[PDB]
Amino acid sequence: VDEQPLENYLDMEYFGTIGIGTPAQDFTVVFDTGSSNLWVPSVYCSSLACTNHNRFNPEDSSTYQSTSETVSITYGTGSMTGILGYDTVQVGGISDTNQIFGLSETEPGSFLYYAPFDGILGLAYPSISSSGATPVFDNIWNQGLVSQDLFSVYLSADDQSGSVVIFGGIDSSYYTGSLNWVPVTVEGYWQITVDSITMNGEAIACAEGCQAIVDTGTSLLTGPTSPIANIQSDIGASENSDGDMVVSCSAISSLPDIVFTINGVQYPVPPSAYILQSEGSCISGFQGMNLPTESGELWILGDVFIRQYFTVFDRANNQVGLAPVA
Questions:
Q1: Does the annotation count 215 as an active-site position?
Q2: Catalytic, out of 11, 32, 87, 314
Q3: What start-end ranges are recorded for coiled-coil regions in this protein?
């Protein structure tokens, strides 16, 4: 339909190029199902990270409209501060007219200095948008620019090309079998219930349900530190000298699958997925991290999981669709 190709950066970041302004100034942004704002750096920004990324210049856009509204976004690791503007955004072949977006003035610290993308384009619900800014996909829907109120994500493996976000449609050739549907529990993130996590038929974690977010913007499978510790020992991972969670590469042949049961359907994740090969080394794809929400402790099904399952994000019916990648 309307395809946006993404680049696979070392199986860790997925980003694509969008246009802003008339004529379009180009940025690479993370397609982030774990946040809702669009922002890019601007000529108003002198922070470290602003020295080596593309900077939007409002003056070169004949369609740019300013506001007197400000935005702050705090992230996993980075943060920005800036102002809100309107312009036309080219995303996935679509002219998304009248799009509110963040222009940064400050991008503190240094995490964003090393990142390979300029900014971020969130695909979650408007309720977690900073300064209630209309998210991109919401704007495209309200202007009737897609025929279906959903989008799809195929994430490729092993540095390959082919990763894609499909706005307003599903393409069958990216998956095997048929879609199963999981209702979204709390509308903000793409939040779903996991019924349990098992290995060899035993519940190693989340034995009686837990909450997870389907997040294209996080690289690894993430959970609360304690149950992650149990999982790390079950796969024979170990802290080494410099903190990293290493596993012997022999293991990939003999470890059982780790199965996420979601809405009564089992989704196996094989060791070739949840163990990452840095060629010389094999590290665990599971990471400990306590995220306190009202929901309590959140799991994050990140790129490790999404690579195994073509994911449909259905805003009409508030549900997530999953099926094995082809």
A1: yes
A2: 32
A3: none
32 is an active site residue: yes
Q: Which residues pair with 28 in a beta bridge?
A: 17
- CB neighbour list of residue 290: distance below 8 Å, 6 or more residues apart: 224, 225, 297
> 166 and 291 share a domain?
no
- Give ∠ CA 21-32-128 in degrees, rounded to 5: 95
Resolution at which this structure was determined, Å: 2.6
Residue 4: give the domain boundaries.
Answer: 1-170
Breaks (C-N over 2.5 A) in the chain follow: none
The number of domains in the chain is: 2
- The structure tokens listed for 303 are 């790129």
CATH code: domain of residue 91: 2.40.70.10
Alpha helices in the chain (DSSP H): 111-114, 136-142, 225-234, 251-254, 271-274, 303-306
**Which residue spans within 135-220 are E strands per DSSP?**
150-154, 164-167, 180-183, 191-194, 196-199, 202-205, 210-214
User: Is it true that the peptide bond before 23 is cis, omega within 30 degrees of 0?
Assistant: yes
Paired with 258 in beta bridges are 199, 269
Q: Which residue in 11, 87, 118, 215 is the catalytic one?
A: 215
- Which of these, 35, 33, 32, 6, lies nearest to 18 by C-alpha position? 6
Q: Are residue 177 and residue 163 in the same domain, yes or no?
A: no
